[PDB]
Amino acid sequence: GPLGSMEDFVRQCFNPMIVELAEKAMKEYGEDPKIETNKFAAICTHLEVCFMYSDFHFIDERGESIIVESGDPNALLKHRFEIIEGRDRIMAWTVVNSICNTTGVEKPKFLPDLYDYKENRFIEIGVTRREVHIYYLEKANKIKSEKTHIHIFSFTGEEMATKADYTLDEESRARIKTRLFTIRQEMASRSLWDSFRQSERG
Numbered sequence: 001g002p003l004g005s006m007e008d009f010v011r012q013c014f015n016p017m018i019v020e021l022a023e024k025a026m027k028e029y030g031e032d033p034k035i036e037t038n039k040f041a042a043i044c045t046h047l048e049v050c051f052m053y054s055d056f057h058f059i060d061e062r063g064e065s066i067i068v069e070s071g072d073p074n075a076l077l078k079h080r081f082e083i084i085e086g087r088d089r090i091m092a093w094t095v096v097n098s099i100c101n102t103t104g105v106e107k108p109k110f111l112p113d114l115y116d117y118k119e120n121r122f123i124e125i126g127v128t129r130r131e132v133h134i135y136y137l138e139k140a141n142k143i144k145s146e147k148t149h150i151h152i153f154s155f156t157g158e159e160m161a162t163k164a165d166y167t168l169d170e171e172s173r174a175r176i177k178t179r180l181f182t183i184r185q186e187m188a189s190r191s192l193w194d195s196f197r198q199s200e201r202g
């Protein structure tokens with residue numbers, strides 16, 4: 001079929017909020033979304049996975065974890081996850097420092113993606129176009145702390161998480177994997193997948 005543009009794909013298949021946050025991020029690091037288009041789509045995918053990882057997870061009045069999949073969260077509920085990805089450098093480190101000085105969790109040396117108030121640990125989310133095992137070791141080599149939890153997703157359904165601890169239930173992670181499959185399939189229908197997959201480096 002005809003070859004579409006990655007630009008058109010991102011703006012049509014991702015929520016405007018995600019696209020905007022992704023554009024601001026690329027600008028902050030000095031890359032143009034309209035040239036580094038495969039990276040643009042990868043940033044949006046990763047960010048959406050971070051949001052979906054946190055969607056619907058709260059802590060109830062008793063202080064334990066529960067899922068509320070409706071858009072009516074009781075006021076006494078607190079979000080289970082703090083989201084760090086998507087913020088600018090200054091706000092991201094402001095959130096991190098706040099969490100650390102509050103919980104005693106030592107400060108990470110690279111910005112993580114989430115903080116889990118249930119497990120009391122930061123999370124590094126990974127979305128790889130290659131083997132999860134290869135990508136996990138890459139991420140881990142940047143974290144000699146051992147305290148930040150790692151959770152890797154692939155576009156073909158494989159996962160790898162630190163100590164075989166996957167944090168979320170199967171249904172939550174199934175939503176993420178289903179979304180990643182939809183992304184891959186739509187890119188393929190537009191003849192964008194081959195280039196997008198091969199453009200990952202590490």
Ligand SMILES: O=C(O)c1ccc(-c2cc(O)c(=O)[nH]c2-c2ccc(F)cc2)cc1
Nearest residue numbers: 025026029038039042043046113125126127
């Ligand atoms: O080469 C690419 O296509 C690419 C490489 C790395 C990332 C990425 C991965 C992460 O796990 C993360 O937390 N974050 C990022 C991330 C997020 C926003 C940015 F502006 C840059 C990198 C995303 C894309």
Ligand SMILES: [Mg+2]
Nearest residue numbers: 025085086111
């Ligand atoms: Mg980031």
Ligand SMILES: [Mn+2]
Nearest residue numbers: 085111112113
């Ligand atoms: Mn990140």
Ligand SMILES: [Mn+2]
Nearest residue numbers: 113124125126
């Ligand atoms: Mn990440």
